[PDB]
Amino acid sequence: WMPAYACQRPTPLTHHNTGLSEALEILAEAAGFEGSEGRLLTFCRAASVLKALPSPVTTLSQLQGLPHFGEHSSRVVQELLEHGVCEEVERVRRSERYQTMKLFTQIFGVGVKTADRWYREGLRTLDDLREQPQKLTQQQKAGLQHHQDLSTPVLRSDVDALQQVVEEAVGQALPGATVTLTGGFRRGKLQGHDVDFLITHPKEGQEAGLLPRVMCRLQDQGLILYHQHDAFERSFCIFRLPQPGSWKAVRVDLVVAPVSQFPFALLGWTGSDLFQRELRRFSRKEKGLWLNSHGLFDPEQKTFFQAASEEDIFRHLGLEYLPPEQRNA
DNA sequence: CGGCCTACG
DNA sequence: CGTA
DNA sequence: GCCG
Ligand SMILES: Nc1nc2c([nH]c(=O)n2[C@H]2C[C@H](O)[C@@H](COP(=O)(O)OP(=O)(O)OP(=O)(O)O)O2)c(=O)[nH]1
Ligand SMILES: [Mg+2]
Ligand SMILES: [Mg+2]
Ligand code: NA
């Protein structure tokens, strides 16, 4: 009994079907590059089902009945099991379009629509973009400037150092405010593309205006290479992280939430991306409730659920609780 | 057939 | 659009 | 692409 929504089953970080899931994820990414979010989602959901299975799939038979496996995903698996390669996957992954779209969308500040326009204009390399700086937003200029460092995996030692400097700035900005590591590192990942932190204060309302004060204190300590900055509560930053004898750029996301919303923000920002999309879809389509990073809303009674923990949210949705390390959908 | 997560910057 |  |  494989449940159909990813939020209904545990997905560990280490799983048993990486060859098959990787192939489906290439097809998902290619679907996104061609503007089909629906096909992207199906291929991601199928890949995720494989990550939740207890053992390796060795025979096509083992897919029977699994949700999100239809004719196309099944054929991909069948070719991989019988030949060790899937022609369609190889054609996609070796194509100029796929490789260029992947290169460009991996830049901070560049998504599919921007990458597709550049591709249609004949651009193919990072050097091509550097030569045409007037095509770039300031966010994209920062992403390109720091691209090599941003392609280096962030490690747990980096997380620990960043948490210390963020806690220092937060404490200087508002006594009693707290910093919680979220994102993939909270799910047990050993590396990441960035570090995500959620900031609050135990007294509702005290955190208003906090994030500009934090950003100013980090900027004055020379720690900020790029940020968007009158009020704001999320910052998608690039930090200058000291290293032995030098420094490296690291993407850091900072989000401030009132404490009433903390469990919802913690749940949302802990991910994974697919886990949260599936949880929000489940909430609305199966329970008639609207979930976001601020709350859980009953649109008929026009009321918000008062959760004290992530556990409370799962319970109000009729779901078995999953700890962060089982949300790796 | 239409849906496919979410809200902030 | 970007965060993604 | 798959599903409700
Ligand atoms: N990347 C991404 N995150 C999303 C989306 N929707 C959504 O609610 N989120 C939430 C869940 C993610 O765990 C959380 C933090 O995002 P992230 O991009 O830093 O990803 P991550 O920490 O899980 O993984 P990573 O940084 O190692 O790559 O944001 C979405 O479409 N993409
Ligand atoms: Mg992250
Ligand atoms: Mg992030
Ligand atoms: Na990008």
Which among A52, A50, A22 has a CA at the least distance from the CA of A60? A50
CA A21 to each of CA A16, A45, A50, A214, A228: distance values in angstroms, whole numbers, following the listed order: 10, 10, 6, 40, 36
Residue A253: active-site member: yes
A11-70 residues near strand C (Cβ < 7 Å) = none
- Is A268 touching ligand 1 by the criterion CB < 6 Å? yes
Do A250 and A269 sit in the same domain of this protein?
Answer: no
Do A272 and A251 sit in the same domain of this protein?
Answer: no
Yes or no: say if A73 and A43 are a contact pair by the CB < 8 Å rule. yes
Instruction: Write the CB contacts of A13 (distance below 8 Å, at least 6 apart in sequence).
Output: A187, A188, A189, A325, A328
Yes or no: say if A12 and A24 are a contact pair by the CB < 8 Å rule. no
CB atoms within 10 A of CB A303: 11
Do A302 and A248 sit in the same domain of this protein?
Answer: no
Residue A116 assigned to a binding site: no
- Is A269 touching ligand 1 by the criterion CB < 6 Å? yes
Q: Could you tell me the resolution of this structure in angstroms?
A: 1.4
Of the residues A95, A122, A137, the one at which a domain ends: A95
Do A187 and A251 sit in the same domain of this protein?
Answer: yes
Please name the amino acid found at residue A257. A
Do A304 and A271 sit in the same domain of this protein?
Answer: yes
- Is A194 touching ligand 1 by the criterion CB < 6 Å? yes
Do A148 and A163 sit in the same domain of this protein?
Answer: no
Domain count, chain A: 4
Do A253 and A188 sit in the same domain of this protein?
Answer: yes
- Between CA A256 and CA A199 the distance in angstroms is 5
Residue A196: active-site member: yes
Residue A36 token pair: 């089909």
End-to-end C-alpha distance for chain A, whole angstroms: 17
Distance of CA A292 to the CA centre of its chain: 15
Do A163 and A251 sit in the same domain of this protein?
Answer: yes
Do A90 and A31 sit in the same domain of this protein?
Answer: yes
Structure-solving method = X-ray
Residue burial A78-117, b: 16+ Cβ < 10 Å; e: rest: ebbbeeeebebbeebbeeeebebbebbbebbbbebebbbe
- Between CA A262 and CA A265 the distance in angstroms is 5
- Only one residue has tokens 């992530």, namely A310
Do A196 and A286 sit in the same domain of this protein?
Answer: no
Ligand 1 binding pocket mutation candidate from A44, A273, A280 (most atoms within 8 A of CB):
A273
CA A24 to each of CA A28, A46, A87, A280, A317: distance values in angstroms, whole numbers, following the listed order: 6, 7, 12, 23, 29
Distance of CA A290 to the CA centre of its chain: 20
- Between CA A254 and CA A171 the distance in angstroms is 14
Can you give chain A as a three-state secondary structure string?
CCCCCHHHCCECCCCCCHHHHHHHHHHHHHHHHCCCHHHHHHHHHHHHHHHHCCCCCCCHHHHCCCCCCCHHHHHHHHHHHHHCCCHHHHHHHCCHHHHHHHHHHCCCCCCHHHHHHHHHCCCCCHHHHHCCHHHCCHHHHHHHHCHHHHCCCEEHHHHHHHHHHHHHHHHHHCCCCEEEECHHHHCCCCEECCEEEEEECCCCCCCCCHHHHHHHHHHHCCCEEECCCCCCCEEEEEEEEEECCEEEEEEEEEEECCHHHHHHHHHHHHCCHHHHHHHHHHHHHHHCCEEECCEEEECCCCEECCCCCHHHHHHHCCCCCCCHHHECC
Of the residues A201, A236, A259, the one at which a domain ends: A259
- Between CA A313 and CA A296 the distance in angstroms is 8
Tally the C-alpha atoms within 13 A of residue A138's C-alpha that lie toward its C-beta. Answer: 8
Yes or no: say if A316 and A306 are a contact pair by the CB < 8 Å rule. no
Yes or no: say if A183 and A269 are a contact pair by the CB < 8 Å rule. yes
Which among A8, A30, A47 has a CA at the least distance from the CA of A281? A8
Partners of A291 in the beta sheet? A296
Residue A196 assigned to a binding site: yes
Of the residues A214, A235, A259, the one at which a domain ends: A259
Which among A56, A7, A72 has a CA at the least distance from the CA of A279? A7
Domain span at residue A160 reads: 153-259
Please name the amino acid found at residue A310. E
- Only one residue has tokens 């799983």, namely A15
Do A43 and A61 sit in the same domain of this protein?
Answer: yes
Do A173 and A253 sit in the same domain of this protein?
Answer: yes
Yes or no: say if A177 and A214 are a contact pair by the CB < 8 Å rule. no
Cβ burial, residue A65 (10 Å; 0-12/13-18/19+): exposed
Cβ burial, residue A129 (10 Å; 0-12/13-18/19+): buried
Closest ligand to residue A113's CA = 4
Yes or no: say if A198 and A266 are a contact pair by the CB < 8 Å rule. yes
